[PDB]
DNA sequence: TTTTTTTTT
């Protein structure tokens, strides 16, 4: 729902352009920002504020739904399969939409091999009537290889040009670019309404470790990180996409432990750990999930991505 | 792209000299440093900060590329061959640019024999139209021998004077010099734009083991090390060179294990282990690589470097 | 190369005496110690620290040399011959300066017979214009015999008094004395500038085996040892001497193996093994060397030292 | 909230 539906509610059209200057295009963007993010960042009068907060209430309802009539509103969620059959039974059918799925691993356990398989598998028609669409890949470690996507595209028998032209790409150079680029992701989702399906970020803490070193900067690091994860949760519901996030690990003297404190641990919905086993086999295990229990499976990082 | 393109964007020329006093010469140096590294280190003001961050946006784009149109931007990456044919098929053609390749070994497995061969092989025209250029060699163990480069230069039939005058050299005496010298490497790459090709460091952890001994100094050791590896990754993309890094090993009581924790293991792109086999034959094996699988080969440390 | 050249750079003369109280006499002693070894061991302000680190930069250059112009700076390295002709062709002319040469053996293979020959041979004029000088002998096993040096001094036809007065001697009683005595070696090299040539230690691990027994003290043993070997490498370049080190052996159930783990194996430059053969003949073999290949020779421990 | 070290007989 675009924002032009409010100028017929007595709002000036000049207020429509200034709401687009801060990054608000849809009517749910009004319902997520506070009154403090409009009054004290633009600097308008507070009579100018509730005139567009009253106009947003002449729309999608304020109130309550039953759990039964909400459950049929939850049918638009899809599941993007990962590439192997046992790994989908862990997650319940693959990587869920309207959520943040985080898969951390130690050193070589296939986290950019998993993100390269999803750049091909999310373009194919699959289970539940999922039609497939374009993909945005924000990079952090400089480990995206386009000719590695060719080795996976011949396993599913898809042509070379259709795979690489449906994958956007941008490298974030510092931790300010990781919050700069999320303005261009929200604008890219807004134009082609309903085409994009997946947003893959590589290691989100790969740039926070080196830009906020020490203990005197720990309080700012977990505050610039929490404002990013709340933005990723809002984008994932405003436009109905799936977010996949790679994480790193540290030791624990007093035995590993994921980087990022309780703030990354609470905001994430699904948590997977990849370990290394027999040769080219990896072992995946669910820590945190609202519905799936703790179980294990086995990968195979082959020449065509992740298999069995 | 030099930094003089911003004084035509209303910036004072006095701001150009103070940006050079902290080590920023190119326009990508602006795009990598934060706003906190300019405001809270140098004598500048807030309003003085976004005036040069707005001027840097009137340049190379912020936005997104497709993977297909990015793949032809990835043609400027080269590959420096190592000296033997089977060892190049492991890495995919040799040591890649825009990356950090780390080769660790146990005790005598040819790690300064491999770094002496690259001081000759990266000056010769080779595969993919790679023209060859100068080389910077930062030393840590005091094991660089100039008359050892003569024994390798006669194998490729190159004169003595042309080999030794295209190899710079500096010994780092302590772990502060390893971060001091990387200012002079960035200045040396900046003058002759496009001549240097390789940056070889010897054992980067040979000075961190003895300057930060104990467990009360483990937290500072892995924080001064992470700020160095992020600088090596930035230099390797700002000027399009290849970084080669030697590492040592420790035991593992509970069987070897490389020195340097998960921080060196994540920042490195390619990981090679050299073992000792039959006599003068060594055995190389890939652990970590974004594209190449785990396979093995065989060396021969001869009198002319590494052969077959 | 004394430290008085900094009081003409605005430094107080009272700072000159406190730098001598911690063992810094030459300008290269500033270039090897960190900023943490001056700030947190003396307890000065950190404005007092960079005032002498800026004053040390108005001196011998920071920067880069070519390999050709460095190769003529490597002409001051000498070679101390061992006493037999075939054993010098292994090492390339004898025991090199600016390095650490370690010769381990099993039980009776002539390691204090080799260290007694070098107490005479390093006082004689030899190849490459090497003039000969005084010798420091740190003992660990109580096996230095002065009247054994007389039997070797008549083979080279040198008088008795000139041999014994050019050999200093001190016995280290425990593993704290091995780090205590290296303060007096640095002071002895500093007074007669250019007279001393050799520093012979006997078995450096003969006192670390008995003072750190167990596995609960293995982590401290290899950390007090690594701080000693980095001090021996720094002294060997600060004053241009040669270091010779004797080592012991252990078994290997799962066949011998040298005592001292990967830390002694990496810091050592040249590694020789002495085996026993036909009667009074021994067999020497190179393991680790940056330039010489693995080859064998034969000794003869005669009544006048090592011969052919 | 952050960060792994180190072979013996
Ligand atoms: N095409 C391929 N076929 C088979 N195995 C591969 C292939 N590419 C990579 N591998 C293996 O996959 C592992 C590396 O995968 P990768 O996704 O890079 O792990 P990673 O965790 O991302 N590395 P890092 O970023 O440092 O944590 C190594 O074991 C490689 O040998
Ligand atoms: N003057 C000499 N003439 C001939 N043989 C000698 C003489 N002195 C010692 N030896 C022999 O040399 C061997 C001892 O040499 P030595 O250098 O002490 O070995 P070592 O390894 O140092 N002993 P250790 O310190 O316990 O390992 C024995 O075989 C002696 O018999
Ligand atoms: N010119 C040469 N010809 C043949 N073999 C050689 C030559 N120079 C060295 N070697 C051998 O190469 C090995 C040493 O190579 P080197 O690169 O020093 O290993 P390294 O791992 O760097 N040693 P380290 O630094 O302690 O780990 C030994 O086996 C030597 O015998
Ligand atoms: Ca990765
Ligand atoms: Ca002895």
Numbering used by the authors:
A (entry chain A), B (entry chain B), C (entry chain C): 22 to 275, 284 to 337
From the article:
During HR, a recombinase binds to single-stranded DNA (ssDNA) and forms a right-handed helical nucleoprotein filament, known as a presynaptic filament, which then searches double-stranded DNA (dsDNA) for homology. Eukaryotic RAD51 and DMC1 both catalyze strand displacement and strand exchange. Interestingly, DMC1 possesses the ability of stabilizing mismatch-containing recombination intermediates (low-fidelity recombinase), whereas the RAD51 lacks the ability to do so (high-fidelity recombinase). RAD51 and DMC1 are members of the RecA family of DNA recombinases and share ~50% amino acid identity and similar biochemical properties.
We first solved the cryo-EM structures of human DMC1 filaments with ssDNA and dsDNA (homologous) in presynaptic and postsynaptic states (Structure 1, 3.33 Å and Structure 2, 3.47 Å, respectively), in the presence of adenylyl-imidodiphosphate (AMP-PNP) and Ca2+. Similar to the corresponding complexes of RAD51, both structures adopt a well-ordered helical structure, with six protein protomers interacting with six triplets of DNA. The bound DNA is organized into near B-form base triplets separated by ~8 Å between adjacent triplets.
